[PDB]
Amino acid sequence: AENQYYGTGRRKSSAARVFIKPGNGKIVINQRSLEQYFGRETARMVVRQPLELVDMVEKLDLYITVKGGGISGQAGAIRHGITRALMEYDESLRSELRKAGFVTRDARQVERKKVGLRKARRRPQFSKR
Amino acid sequence: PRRRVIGQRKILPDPKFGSELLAKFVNILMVDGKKSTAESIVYSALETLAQRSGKSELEAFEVALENVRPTVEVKSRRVGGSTYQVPVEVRPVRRNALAMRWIVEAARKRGDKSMALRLANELSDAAENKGTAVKKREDVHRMAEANKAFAHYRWLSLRSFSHQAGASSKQPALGYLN
Amino acid sequence: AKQSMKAREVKRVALADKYFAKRAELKAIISDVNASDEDRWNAVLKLQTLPRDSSPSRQRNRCRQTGRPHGFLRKFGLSRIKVREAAMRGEIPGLKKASW
Amino acid sequence: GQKVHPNGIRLGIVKPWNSTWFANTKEFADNLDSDFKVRQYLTKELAKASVSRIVIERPAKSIRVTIHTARPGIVIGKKGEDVEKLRKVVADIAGVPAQINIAEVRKPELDAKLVADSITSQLERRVMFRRAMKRAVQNAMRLGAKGIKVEVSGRLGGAEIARTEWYREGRVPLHTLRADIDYNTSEAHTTYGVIGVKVWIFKGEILGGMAAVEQPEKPAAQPKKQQRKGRK
Amino acid sequence: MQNQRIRIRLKAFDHRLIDQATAEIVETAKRTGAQVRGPIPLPTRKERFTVLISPHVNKDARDQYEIRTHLRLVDIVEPTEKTVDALMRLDLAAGVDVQISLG
Amino acid sequence: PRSLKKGPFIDLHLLKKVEKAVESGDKKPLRTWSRRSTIFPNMIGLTIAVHNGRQHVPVFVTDEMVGHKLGEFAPTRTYRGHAADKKAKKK
RNA sequence: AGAACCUUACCUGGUCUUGACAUCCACGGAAGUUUUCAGAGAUGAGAAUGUGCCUUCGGGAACCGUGAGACAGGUGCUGCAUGGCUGUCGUCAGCUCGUGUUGUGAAAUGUUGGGUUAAGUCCCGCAACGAGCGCAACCCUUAUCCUUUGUUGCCAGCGGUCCGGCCGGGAACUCAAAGGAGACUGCCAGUGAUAAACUGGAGGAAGGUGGGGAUGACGUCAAGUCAUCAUGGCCCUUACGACCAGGGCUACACACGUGCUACAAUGGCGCAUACAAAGAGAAGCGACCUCGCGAGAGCAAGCGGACCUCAUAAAGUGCGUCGUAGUCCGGAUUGGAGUCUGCAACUCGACUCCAUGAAGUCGGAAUCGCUAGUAAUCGUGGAUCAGAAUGCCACGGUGAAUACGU
Incomplete structure (x- = not known):
């Protein structure tokens, strides 16, 4: 069953699972502190931004489990994840951001290495002279 | 060639500064594909900028980006005899990007212990209009003002419109020349 | 392309498996550090001369059936061109291409 | 001029492959040689009319023949003795006992x-x-x-x-x-x-073949029939 | 943590035969248990090949080929001896191998 | 940069020729084609004629050559001088 | 696609010509194995296991020697002699199939105008008409989201409880692989010849055949492969063959194609710190163990692949350290040792490391890819693979400027 609201936050092929509840201004990520997972790096500023935009930097509590990233990017799945869950305090919060573009699933899909070529789109370099 | 309008990829505003102009800047600071090193390097640079002048975090950044900002480019359009190089107006998208690119191309000539100090010395300088890209702006506006003395197929064109029921032209155009 | 390079190669592979499988710790006893004044001698090189004419080190896992020099693929029993010919004709299970 | 053949990558998508077997990606060379030797020599044996496809199959301890014919009648030869001589040598090549069934009107x-x-x-x-x-x-x-x-x-x-x-x-x-x-x-x-x-x-x-399927589908047999795996 | 006490896996390089054979076992599992079973989509494998496309002259084109091996599982949240007994008679076999062992 | 492994590396093949020469310090130049092998005490005091890819070249073996191979003192390649065309010192 | 010998064409030297391997016949031998010794090894002598298959019980076949012919064998010549196959122009935007019409006709027309588009996409339209290839579509794959599964997958809550999905148990949840839901200038607005179509608006992950792959016309080019393989013309068949050994294309005169990694500070050095997806592993890989100086060693649980292992995933992140001094960047060469894969590391193989210690501070002509999961840059794994990666193939991480104009 449900007991917390839930966000999926899929951006850049990282997924932020985000369980939101009333509390104090507070983050735990993978049963570890912020100084540990995002210590002094630009990712620290990414995750606080959606709480600062909604001015609930002191009364939302969060629990964060994240798979399938890299360090700065997982913070970016968190940026979509916090607002994905927060649709169930206000459903029109998420509507107006979807109309501005500013919450959205990230706009790049997979592309493969191509047949006979040295990269995804780069062909075999040759002088031929 | 292009036969209809096609937009550009850009990402959303900054995670510290909440500005597009910051979001394009850290992007043009990018080295090895890594946006996550350039973010910290830009913010550590602006904090040094804040010790040089105690008025804002962006003080020398925003105004460098005002002073070294171009407006014009040169294109080549010539057939037959002699018509010379022909100037065009730059769109805002390229104004902003030429300025930030010139600010970091200039910045690298310095050797210090963090990239942040370097980039902070070129912004503080360009802010006072003694930067290295003051010259790059000046050269480009002098050349665009000079090369309007003659432009493409000018002599025959002055006949060609007037006989076609079409309006004034001087520039290559789809379906027929000027 | 020649039958003589196919004829050498085919006999080497059945005897590489015969002779070296039962002489795989002999390699440890005469080269590797598993000996330390123990044996290290002529009496076991009396036996490693059998896996020599026919041994993995002379069996380039190729040309045991087909007459194409290099690009062999030991998993099909074939080479570049004959993998492509059999795909064209559907004679391989599961053969498609990646589209992702 | 050019002559490319591109359709070599389609032949298990809305049509059958001429082979369907399993080898755990280690026994593939041994199974691909037996599947050739069975292709080459069975279609020479039924050379007394015509064949539209040949489909070769690996059951548990067995090699199973499928054939697509103009008719199940005079293609395979009168009497089942002729179709037993086909199993005699199919069994010999793969190294297991052999089956054959007859099919298809095409x-x-x-x-x-x-x-x-x-x-x-x-x-x-x-x-x-x-x-x-x-x-x-x-x-x-x-x-x-x-x-x-x-x-x-x-x-x-x-x-x-x-x-x-x-x-x-x-x-x-x-x-x-x-x-x-x-x-x-x-x-x-x-x-x-x-x-x-x-x-x-x-x-x-x-159309074309006995196939329409293109994948291994995961919602199969179960389109909206949901389980809870608990409290039930 | 719900798991199985005996492993059954189905492995094929042809995708259509294994999907049918799996479906016959899912019904066997539902006939020899208390819950609504279906396909476990365990990660399906692909081994990567590159070859020529002209026998000698020019290489700007080449070819890349795939061969896939499709993996199914066929287990109740905890299986029973009545499931393995019914399963093993009702399993299909013509171009898939079912292994009933662990390893 | 690199050197070889441990134990003897004599083999069966160098052994049977060498053994009839070692009792007598040497007898005759030993017709050798299996030039992949390392030198050893049993091979000191001898003269081993070492096939090169074309013919055997006689090697007098000494106490210094014992770390070295047999076909190493024997050529396999060609030479040109350092900025002109010139026929090779090496067969 | 992984060139020590093998491979491998080439070469030399041993050794033989129905021939080194098939079928067919004649004769002797069971084939196979193990083993001492001479010889480089082939080979030869001698030893030891076995006398099997079928049988006018002679003898033959399997396989080996040897011979007779058919015939095997040939990177043998020939690709203005071919079959099979494929590069180019190009994503050109055309090419062609059925057929009428205008000229005497070769041929045109269609296949060209206007609007729209990368496009012959599609609206309008003339004797050019209709339609297919190219290309649009179904396609596979992905994306929110709908959907099913429920392990080798997961845990908002609850339990055993060291508070670990290990396990009682649960389906809110990532989560994996798949049908795919969705998007059509259809909707609403502007434009545009009604219109196709472009652009704006909105809900939605997203408005512009959704992202991505597949994807390449008739066909000139005397294109190129007889060396996958087919094959005549046409030559050797004691050989333009073959068993066996060793060498070789990575020599060195110089230059040159291409890629890696680096020339630093965004970073390296040390130490510590964070989350992957993908996939392969029974003469293989593999925890722990004892052994070792890193490297590695044997012993061995384990392993079919979200079960164990490669794996500490790296880049990226933290601190202290380091600028123009070729260093605290880069660490090559080579001596030399320790180690590896292998009868065999020397020219031509992998890895650790000690001593000494260079080039390189962004490079002339030249020279290529890119519209976005791209470019770039990092690690990972596999095909190849005895032993060679920096290469190639695929996977996932972080992830950019701009597209006015022809």
Whole structure:
């Protein structure tokens, strides 16, 4: 069953699972502190931004489990994840951001290495002279 | 060639500064594909900028980006005899990007212990209009003002419109020349 | 392309498996550090001369059936061109291409 | 000019592959040699009429033959003794005991390989190739092909150098990953040297074969039938 | 943590035969248990090949080929001896191998 | 940069020729084609004629050559001088 | 696609010509194995296991020697002699199939105008008409989201409880692989010849055939492969063959194609710190163990692949350290040792490391890819693979400027 609201936050092929509840201004990520997972790096500023935009930097509590990233990017799945869950305090919060573009699933899909070529789109370099 | 309008990829505003102009800047600071090193390097640079002048975090950044900002480019359009190089107006998208690119191309000539100090010395300088890209702006506006003395197929064109029921032209155009 | 390079190669592979499988710790006893004044001698090189004419080190896992020099693929029993010919004709299970 | 064949990657997508077996990606060379040796030699044994496809299968401790015929009657030979001689040698090649079942009504005149044989046969005996190829097409689309493409080459006209010909009619699209695109290249000799004809046939976009399936599907058998795995 | 006490896996390089054979076992599992079973989509494998496309001259084109091996599982949240007994008679076999062992 | 492994590396093949020469310090130049092998005490005091890819070249073996191979003192390649065309010192 | 010998064409030297391997016949031998010794090894002598298959019980076959012929064998010549196959122009935007019409006709027309588009995409339209290839579509794959599964997958809550999905148990949840839901200038607005179509608006992950792959016309080019393989013309068949050994294309005169990694500070050095997806592993890989100086060693649980292992995933992140001094960047060469894969590391193989210690501070002509999961840059794994990666193939991480104009 449900007991917390839930966000999926899929951006850049990282997924932020985000369980939101009333509390104090507070983050735990993978049963570890912020100084540990995002210590002094630009990712620290990414995750606080959606709480600062909604001015609930002191009364939302969060629990964060994240798979399938890299360090700065997982913070970016968190940026979509916090607002994905927060649709169930206000459903029109998420509507107006979807109309501005500013919450959205990230706009790049997979592309493969191509047949006979040295990269995804780069062909075999040759002088031929 | 292009036969209809096609937009550009850009990402959303900054995670510290909440500005597009910051979001394009850290992007043009990018080295090895890594946006996550350039973010910290830009913010550590602006904090040094804040010790040089105690008025804002962006003080020398925003105004460098005002002073070294171009407006014009040169294109080549010539057939037959002699018509010379022909100037065009730059769109805002390229104004902003030429300025930030010139600010970091200039910045690298310095050797210090963090990239942040370097980039902070070129912004503080360009802010006072003694930067290295003051010259790059000046050269480009002098050349665009000079090369309007003659432009493409000018002599025959002055006949060609007037006989076609079409309006004034001087520039290559789809379906027929000027 | 020649039958003589196919004829050498085919006999080497059945005897590489015969002779070296039962002489795989002999390699440890005469080269590797598993000996330390123990044996290290002529009496076991009396036996490693059998896996020599026919041994993995002379069996380039190729040309045991087909007459194409290099690009062999030991998993099909074939080479570049004959993998492509059999795909064209559907004679391989599961053969498609990646589209992702 | 160019001549590419692109449809080599389609042949388990809305049509059957000529082989379906499992080898745990370690025994594939041993199983691919037995599957060839069984292809080459069974279609020579039923050489007394024609065949439209050959489909070879690996059950537990067994090798199982499927065949697509003009009829289950006079193709495989009268008496089941002739079909037991087929299991005798199929069993010998793979190294396990052998099965055979007979199937399918589909004529080999809708199919590639009897069409390519029939147009080389004219050319081998120097009768015709200007209209021999067009009657192939006529005879093919009247039994079910929405389109057929033919290329004939050889030493055509008795000429001391080589010539080409081609003919397309109906639709043969290759901007694809599906359809049945049923294909054969004949090779045969005549009193000038070697000749050959290339036949691409298009039966349908999801017709042609005994298949329509294109994947291993995961919502299968269970479209909206949900389980909770708990409290039930 | 719900798991199985005996492993059954189905492995094929042809995708259509294994999907049918799996479906016959899912019904066997539902006939020899208390819950609504279906396909476990365990990660399906692909081994990567590169070859020529002209026998000698020019290489700007080449070819890349795939062969896939499709993996199914066929287990209740905890299986029973009545499931393995019914399963093993009702399993299909013509181009898939079912292994009933662990390893 | 690199050197070889441990134990003897004599083999059966160098052994049977060498053994009839070692009792007598040497007898005759030993016709050798299996030039992949390392030198050893049993091979000191001898003269081993070492096939090169074309013919055997006689090697007098000494106490210094004992770390070295047999076909190493024997050529396999060609030479040109350092900025012109010139026929090779090496067969 | 992994060139020590093998491979491998080439070469030399041993050794033989129905021939080194098939079928067919004649004769002697069971084939196979193990083993001492001479010889480089082939080979030869001698030893030891076995006398099997079938049988006018002679003898033959399997396989080996040897011979007779058919015939095997040939990177043998020939690709203005071919079959099979494929590169180019190009994503050109055309090419062609059925057929009428205008000229005496070769041929045109269609296939060209206007609007729209990368496009012959599609609206309008003339004797050019209709339609297919190219290309649009179904396709596979992905994306929110709908959907099913429920392990080798997961845990908002609850339990055993060291508070670990290990396990009682649960389906809110990532989560994996798949049908795919969705998007059509259809909707609403502007434009545009009604219109196709472009652009704006909105809900939605997203408005512009959704992202991505597949994807390449008839066909000239005397294109190129006889060396996958087919094959005549046509030559050797004691050989333009073959068993066996060793060498070789990575020599060196110089230059040159291409890629890696680096020339630093965004970073390296050390130490510590964070989350992957993908996939392969029974003469293989593999925890722990004892052994070792890193490297590695044997012993061995384990391993079919979200079960164990490669794996500490790296880049990226933290601190202290380091600028123009070729260093605290880069660490090559080579001596030399320790180690590896292998009868065999020397020219031509992998890895650790000690001593000494260079080039390189962004490079002339030249020279290529890119519209976005791209470019770039990092690690990972596999095909190849005895032993060679920096290469190639695929996977996932972080992830950019701009597209006015022809």
